[PDB]
Amino acid sequence: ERESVVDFSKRYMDYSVGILIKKISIFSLFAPFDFAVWACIAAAIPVVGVLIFAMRIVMGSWWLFTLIVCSSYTANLAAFLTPVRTFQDLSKQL
Amino acid sequence: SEGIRKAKKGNYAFLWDVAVVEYAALTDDDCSVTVIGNSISSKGYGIALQHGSPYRDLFSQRILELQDTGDLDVLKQKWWPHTGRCDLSFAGVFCILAIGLLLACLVAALELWWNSN
Amino acid sequence: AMRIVMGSWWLFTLIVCSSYTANLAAFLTPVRTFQDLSKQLEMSYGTVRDSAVYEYFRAKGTNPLEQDSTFAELWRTISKNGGADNCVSNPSEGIRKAKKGNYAFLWDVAVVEYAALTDDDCSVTVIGNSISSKGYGIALQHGSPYRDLFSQRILELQDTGDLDVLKQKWWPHTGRCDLSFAGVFCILAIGLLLACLVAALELWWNSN
Amino acid sequence: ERESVVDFSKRYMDYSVGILIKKISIFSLFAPFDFAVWACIAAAIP
Amino acid sequence: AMRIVMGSWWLFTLIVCSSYTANLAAFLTPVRTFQDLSKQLEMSYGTVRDSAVYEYFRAKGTNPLEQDSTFAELWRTISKNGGADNCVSNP
Amino acid sequence: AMRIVMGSWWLFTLIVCSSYTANLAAFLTPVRTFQDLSKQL
């Protein structure tokens, strides 16, 4: 209706709108890991418990086995090494 | 102007020109705000004129070409450059401490239950 | 007693060195990546050569005040040997070429997913980048008293948003293509196999 | 150059022009690591 | 016996302690730096008014086509309080 | 003894935690040295 009887000239800028934002403590380092494999370890010990019925093969499993699980808990210390938290218009509706 | 401090004092994300918020970031003595981008270039902003004017396409030709040279964006970068003024634990005791106190209370329960048995 | 001592507390530190050694190994950790500036240090780009993209990017990627960290990296990638392997004589040449040549450049994303989502690949998904000031408009000539009549209908279709409806008619955005944690089990049941190697051979060797 | 001599109307989109024709979990421990030292342990055993 | 019952605690969270012992030491990385840009975070910045370094670099902490924003940052370091942020008149 | 045992597990704690950040010395830090005089050698 600014075009119905009158006119604009052509574009100086383009369409937008702005959003003004002004600017769990120890739980958060287990969160980079999939929580299912905790119980995948927890069911593995019943499998090892079958072996009641050598033993050094079963020990030698485990000295290789939880090796990496210790390294896996050593892994997620690097959580920043590679106010607002979420940036979607829809994500901030909630 | 109300949306300055009401967004400062009260969880209000606002609906406004980004460039005003850009200069409000350019003015605050502490880098203490947050903005999120927007990109809608199918709709534009032109400049009104008298309905019937001889040089309208000639006006818009400079509107065109100063953007084609990009010096229009240098005019944007005059009053608001790209950097601006704003460039945009030891209390974790109880948490793991409490999960086993279920068991720590349940030990004496099964003790006194079977010791009476 | 004292003869048993030598390699023992030797291993009380060497394996620890080895633990710290294997510890650090990963702590800094067409479609290839996800960000356009991350593309700017990758392989070169398949545009149509001698296009207006080819023209105006040489006009403005060489403009340093109007350089925004991709366009010169764009220019140095595309200008290889005077443009060799970015070869376009007929237009569909560079449009075809580097599917398995593994260069990547795109259109405006409309004609992109017009062709790409009518493909069976969907690893051809290159991320979006388009000229925020240059595109396709609507052409007439000076002196025909028709423009405000028609630019009325130009603005109104997005005022209604039926500009979006007609884009989504012959071009829906949906299409057939809408758009570190398993290493134990790599070697887990290998131990169950070694259990079968050991204890079953013990059982049969006792049965022998 | 066109719009100097023959008038236009408004934009509706932007532009580019490109290419369009169809035609491990744990082993990062070994990208710095020379794999034989496992055997260096296994032969340091006897 | 109940050696089995509660003994999970000196195992697990002691490792969690060793992790907090660790990760903060890694995240660690007279003169501090040799930059006019890395020391923009240091405040109470003494400087002289009515001088050539007071004059010319206000002309060079302005003009946003000058793409070394260190100079404009050190400009706006003192430009507040009318230019009299934490300032002296003479050396 | 129960009292110099204190000195044992503490070194078992301390020295390993003290062994820690020198991995970043191996990890974090083509060119390495920038002096005109340092490259004379």
Side-chain angles (χ1 to χ4, degrees), chain C residues 42-93:
Chain C
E42 296 180 356
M43 299 173 72
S44 72
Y45 302 143
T47 189
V48 161
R49 192 171 63 192
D50 296 332
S51 66
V53 161
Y54 189 77
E55 184 69 29
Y56 188 77
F57 285 167
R58 293 175 292 171
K60 304 300 182 288
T62 58
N63 205 160
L65 293 172
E66 301 174 357
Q67 173 62 39
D68 295 326
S69 297
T70 62
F71 307 104
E73 295 289 329
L74 177 69
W75 177 72
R76 60 180 291 166
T77 48
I78 63 170
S79 299
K80 53 177 189 290
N81 291 318
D85 203 9
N86 299 316
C87 300
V88 169
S89 67
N90 44 359
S92 292
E93 183 181 357

Side-chain angles (χ1 to χ4, degrees), chain E residues 3 7 16-17 31 37 51 56 60 80-81 83 90:
Chain E
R3 286 174 56 89
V16 183
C17 289
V31 60
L37 185 60
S51 63
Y56 172 71
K60 294 296 173 71
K80 64 180 291 295
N81 293 321
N90 53 358

Side-chain angles (χ1 to χ4, degrees), chain C residues 26 46-47 94-95 99 105-108 111 120-121 129-131 133-138 140 142 180-183, chain D residues 3-26 28-29 32:
Chain C
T47 189
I95 296 171
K99 173 253 177 65
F105 188 67
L106 64 154
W107 191 269
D108 194 1
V111 183
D120 298 330
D121 303 335
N129 194 0
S130 186
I131 307 168
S133 298
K134 301 294 189 291
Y136 282 115
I138 287 164
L140 288 84
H142 291 95
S180 174
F181 293 98
Chain D
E3 318 175 15
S4 301
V5 296
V6 292
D7 195 6
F8 279 13
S9 299
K10 290 284 186 176
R11 302 172 59 89
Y12 49 86
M13 289 303 291
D14 288 330
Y15 184 77
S16 296
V17 49
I19 298 169
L20 287 169
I21 285 299
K22 182 180 178 185
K23 276 79 176 175
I24 65 168
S25 178
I26 47 94
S28 65
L29 276 72

Side-chain angles (χ1 to χ4, degrees), chain A residues 48-93:
Chain A
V48 175
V50 178
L51 307 170
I52 298 169
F53 183 73
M55 75 293 195
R56 195 175 182 180
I57 59 167
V58 183
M59 309 288 275
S61 70
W62 196 266
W63 182 271
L64 305 177
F65 169 66
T66 41
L67 183 66
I68 313 298
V69 180
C70 297
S71 303
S72 307
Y73 185 63
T74 323
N76 53 359
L77 305 179
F80 294 98
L81 300 181
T82 298
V84 68
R85 292 183 292 111
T86 317
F87 294 93
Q88 291 297 320
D89 53 352
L90 182 58
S91 293
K92 301 304 292 181
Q93 301 297 320

Side-chain angles (χ1 to χ4, degrees), chain C residues 108-118 162-179:
Chain C
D108 194 1
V109 76
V111 183
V112 175
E113 293 183 353
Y114 175 76
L117 268 68
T118 58
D162 292 331
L163 178 58
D164 304 335
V165 175
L166 295 178
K167 290 190 287 184
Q168 282 291 108
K169 179 191 71 63
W170 53 270
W171 172 69
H173 79 284
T174 64
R176 47 91 52 82
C177 285
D178 51 356
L179 183 62

